[PDB]
Design a binder for this molecule. Sequence first.
Ligand code: HEM
Ligand SMILES: CC[C@H]1OC(=O)[C@H](C)[C@@H](O)[C@H](C)[C@@H](O)[C@@H](C)C[C@@H](C)C(=O)[C@H](C)[C@@H](O)[C@H]1C
Length: 403
Amino acid sequence: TTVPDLESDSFHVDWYRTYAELRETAPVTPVRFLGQDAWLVTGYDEAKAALSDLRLSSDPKKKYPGVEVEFPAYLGFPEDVRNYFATNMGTSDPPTHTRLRKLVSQEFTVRRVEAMRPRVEQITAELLDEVGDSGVVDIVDRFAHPLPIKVICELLGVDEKYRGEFGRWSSEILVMDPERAEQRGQAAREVVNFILDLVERRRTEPGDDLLSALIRVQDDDDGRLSADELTSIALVLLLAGFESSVSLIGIGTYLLLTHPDQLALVRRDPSALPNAVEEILRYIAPPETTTRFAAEEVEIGGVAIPQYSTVLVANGAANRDPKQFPDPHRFDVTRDTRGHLSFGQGIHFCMGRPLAKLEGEVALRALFGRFPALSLGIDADDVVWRRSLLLRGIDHLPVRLDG
Ligand code: HEM
Ligand SMILES: CC[C@H]1OC(=O)[C@H](C)[C@@H](O)[C@H](C)[C@@H](O)[C@@H](C)C[C@@H](C)C(=O)[C@H](C)[C@@H](O)[C@H]1C
């Protein structure tokens, strides 16, 4: 009947209750979003099946006769800008996806990530050193946001004097408001221009960073990254490389601050921190929904998704499907979190998982270790959640350093 409108407050206010009510009626249902028809998948089994079915494409650049492909995430994006944003692993299907991922995997290794551990630890310490010993501060602006941004910049060879602008553009892009479609596309163009200059500088002055290495990566069979591929991969690595981690740190801080019992456990047993981060991701997945396009008719959960349909796989809703995660609304750092979809599923499974876990673990351990009496600076019910189905997070979070 009343087709769900993903722009309504129902999806940004106690929204997991909304996902539950939909999942109960039909884990695969028609919805409206940004002026287009789509299918929302809220069931865990259904979401896993969907992400595993390659008939559900990840490429927004593919053309189909008489069809105008529109991914919600590229709202307001001029075509050329979309291409700059979508010529990488996450926006490619095999065989192209296969070679792009293989080449990037040669340099974006666990070794390279672990080599940054000392840097993550030092940056974390320095940021915490600057907030003081007492009073109220915005833990996002002073910590959760600057840490990942500095880490990804060092990984991608982005000099200090070029880190003060893209954070603002990226922020505008996380929100999908039809009212600001033009501003969103303009923010996107700035990011493109920024990446074009970064690549130019790196080709001219090589270093030991990941971008420099991708400029040189090659393989007898897979070949190498074309100029367009290199540029597009650098772009998403820059944005995806810090935004999801900022969300994790902010959400994790909020969850630990509002679940004293859970925080107590993690502290008593340090070996419990890794799974705590996994549960924080299971509880409130940053990539709440991920988009796919039906290149052919595809049946999911007994529902025939018509060919050329836009499919929104609700990774977050799937993580709260009681059939997969019993007592889903309980944040439990001890639960078996295996199988959650916050890092994806299938061929597009997160390539940054090692780094995301490293940052989350280092950041939360340091923050709560430095401030044993840390407390929320506002009522839990007054925290403002980012209005985005692309990347859920917290943009401002007051905390009292000394309780
Ligand atoms: C807590 C943080 C993170 C979360 C929640 C996360 C989540 C995800 C998810 C859900 C996917 C699959 C998307 C899809 O199926 O279309 C993905 C893909 C990917 N992530 Fe992450 N990610 C995180 C951190 C990172 C970081 C730090 C980087 C980069 C430095 C990164 C790089 C990528 C790349 C390149 C892919 C594309 C894989 C492919 O298409 O083959 N991620 N991530
Ligand atoms: C504006 C649209 C794009 O969004 C972003 O880059 C966001 C800033 C990131 O946080 C997204 C949400 C990532 O965290 C991963 C889930 C997916 C990512 C790796 C992709 O490859 C994917 C194609 C992505 O680039 C687009 C959805």
